[model samples]
Target: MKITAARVIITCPGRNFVTLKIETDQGVYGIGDATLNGRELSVVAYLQEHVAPCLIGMDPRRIEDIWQYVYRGAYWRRGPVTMRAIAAVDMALWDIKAKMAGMPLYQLLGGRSRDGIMVYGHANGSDIAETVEAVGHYIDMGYKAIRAQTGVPGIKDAYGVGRGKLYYEPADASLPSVTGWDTRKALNYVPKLFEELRKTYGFDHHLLHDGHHRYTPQEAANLGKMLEPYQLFWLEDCTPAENQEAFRLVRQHTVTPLAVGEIFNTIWDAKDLIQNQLIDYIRATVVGAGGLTHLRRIADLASLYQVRTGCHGATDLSPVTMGCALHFDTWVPNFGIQEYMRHTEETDAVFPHDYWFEKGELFVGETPGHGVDIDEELAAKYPYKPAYLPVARLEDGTMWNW
Candidate 1:
């Protein structure tokens, strides 16, 4: 089948999501997510200006060839904008190819490696008591694993505590928001939160925490050491992965499993960390790392060192990416866990998917494609909004990661 039309659908149901939908002359279609949380327009422009024109009549089954063309043809190589653009096309083509073969995407990738993909969801509260209560609620709802983020009593806002009960991106500010970071306060308070949570919830359920890259390497090491008794599934984004060698410090100090790479766009960004096994989990999603074609290469490298895939699954990533990731998570042998942040009703309506969340697990359904399809009419109803991820800062005016 040949491509008849390539289009970008930018919608803001609750937050911005840019989706690429490719239609074939044979009436089959496939959807790919192009959202770059808070940076939506860049990918849209890349698709409309650079990628779409070249793909107008190409064979829809040429997934690999198309991927190579976009990668090598660009010459400059990987960056968030370039990879996200190429990722959309790569994901869409995979969707078409899977549908053509009359099998789900995972079937095309050597079939399922597991019965179902295990997923972890966020459970946050205002304090330790409330946080434990939240964990109990998740347990009752069938969640086998939960990541806890709680408010510190003295601090105005603590790391990993999103606004309100749910996870929303309030990082949309133009002037930026300045929040205080107290390592002494965090050091004294965070361990107690996890200690109480594990005590009340029992050790059967897997527990995870996001350090949000707020601590220094030394501080991260100390915090990780403090939580070791709880046997956490993993501690995510404890420190920025840019200065990856710094992980050696945390590695030497604590036994808490480390997870990073939610912000990485290429394998080079994670090469040292994986080669050294400095981290136990890799959090890059398909859309963030140039799509499954590239992600498979990253996972292959990580697998040799026993590093597992724990792809970023926030709702900020449209369901299109989540569906593609679930298929990859099912097929990859080194898969660890998948993050799950439920999407809003309106967002779910725009992109109807066949994937289901049972207990805390997500199943990549036995559908023809990636189990995601865009409702063009509903998608067209919403337009893009200029939003951005937050930039964290110290009280002294120096910037930090968010």
Candidate 2:
């Protein structure tokens, strides 16, 4: 049977999400997410005007060939827009293939490596005491792991201090919002949050933190060294990963179990870190790193060095990406922990999913393909709105990572 048509769906159920729905002449269809946080429209334009037209009349079952045809054929190769476009197509094609085979997506990948995927929830607050309370909230909810973030005393609007409890949408304003960041203030303050967390909750649960790329290699090393007493699960994106070798300096100074690469688009972006064992967990996600196909390649490389998969699961990824990611997390042997930022009820209603959180672990449905579907009617009600993630600046106005 031949692929018939493909369409790009733009929805803003609480937050904007770019979805690509592929249809086959045999009457089967699959959907994938291509949402790129602050820059959502570029991918929509790429899919609608460029990518969708090429899918008509091809064999929907030829997943690999299609991946190469769309990915390699583009000639432009890897970038945010290109990879996101390819990732959406890749996810939908795999969904179609699994549905056609009458099997779950995980089964097609090689069957289960674990019964349930362990996930880490986000816990954030305005101060140390409040952050500790937030951590307790996750513990009370039965989370096996939690990532804690708190506002620095001198820094206004510190990264990860969300306004809501269960949901945190950073892309708040139509134009980018400005947030403050002082590495010295953050460095002095963050370790205290983890110290209080472990003191209150004890060490039975895994604790994690994100430096949010605000620190330099030396500063990250210092922060990692300071947090050694608390025994963190991993310190995520401690420093910018543009220069992959920079992690080596942090590695030389401390053994805090580094995790990086959520912003990455391809395996090459993570080659040195994985091969050289600079990190303990690789956060190259299915959506950000070109869907399950390329993510498998990244996981395979990470496995050789004992690095594991910790696919990014922020609300921006959508339930479609989450459904697809859970399948990957269930199948990969060297699994780390999945990031679990719960989507809003409104967002959940727009994209119905077959995954559920129970006792701190997430489970995928037994249905064929990645058990997730979009309600086009419900999604249409929330028209797309412009939003941008906040930018960071130092006290003197020098730009910094947010």
Candidate 3:
């Protein structure tokens, strides 16, 4: 079927989401998510102003060729905006291809590797006591794995410590808000938080934490080593991944499993880390790593090295992307855990999906394609709003990673 129409839909159920919908001459259609948290319009413009115009009359069946055309044809490659735009087209084509085959998206990806995808939920609080309480709530909700975050006592605004127990949105402000960070304070506080969690929740719990790229290699190593006794599921983004070599330092100093790459837009950003076995999990999701077309390449490469996939699943990623991720997680053999921050009810209602969480596992429904659809009428009601993620500054006023 030839592509007849393509449109960009920008919505803000609570936060901004940019979705690309492709229509075929045969009357079948598919949707892809191009939302890049805090920077939604750039991807919208990239798809609407450039990519969508070129897709008209092209064969929707040529998924691979279309992916290559968008990636290579641009001349410029692998930034967030470019990759997100390419990801949207690639995903939409995959959705169309799967629907035409009369099968779910995972079946098109060589069928299911397991019955269900194991997912982890975010549990954070303002302090150790409250954080442990949040963990209990997730446990009651049937989350077998939990990523715990707690506020440091002295720090004004700690990363991951959100407004409420269930909702932890760091990208809430209209402009970039400056937050303070002290490595020494965090270094001392994190181990204690984990220690308290271990004491209250016991060893069976699969505990995880995000350093949020706030530490240097040595600091990351120190924190990792200290948390080894807790036997964490993984320590995520301990340091900035732009310098892949820094992981070697963290790797040598501790046995705690390392997960990185939510910010990565291409395989090259993670090539060295995967090849050298410096990380245990790859956090590049379908949308950020140029869709399932490219993410499969990264997952296959990681499999050879005994690493696994742990796609980033923040609230920023629309439910459409989450549907795509569950399919990928189900089919990929080198499966790790999936991050799952429960979306607000308003957001869920805007983009209805066919995935459900049960007893710590998320299962994609038997519906055709990715099993996700947006209510254009409902989406239009919540127009785009300006928002930004907080920036970090050291106690001495030097800017740090957030």
State the C-alpha lDDT per candidate: 0.86, 0.91, 0.91
> What is the alpha-carbon lDDT of model 2 when measured against the actual structure?
0.91
Question: TM-score for every candidate vs. truth?
Answer: 0.96, 0.98, 0.98
lDDT of candidate 1? 0.86
The model with the greater TM-score, 1 or 2, is 2
User: By lDDT, highest first, what's the ranking?
Assistant: 3, 2, 1
Q: What lDDT score goes with residue 203 in model 3?
A: 91
Worst 10 residues of 2 by lDDT: 160-169
At residue 339, give the lDDT of candidate 2.
91
| Tens digits of per-residue lDDT for model 3, 182-269 | 9999898899999998899899879999999998999999999999999999999999988889899999999999999999989999
Q: Residue by residue across 289-386, what tens digits does model 1's lDDT show?
A: 99889999999999999999999988789999999999999899999999888888899998889898786788988889998998888977887767
Q: Which residue pairs overlap in candidate 2's backbone? A: none
> Listing every candidate in turn, what is its Cα RMSD in Å to the true structure after a full C-alpha superposition?
1.7, 0.9, 1.0
Task: List runs of model 1 lying over 4 Å from the truth.
Answer: 162-176
Best by lDDT: 3
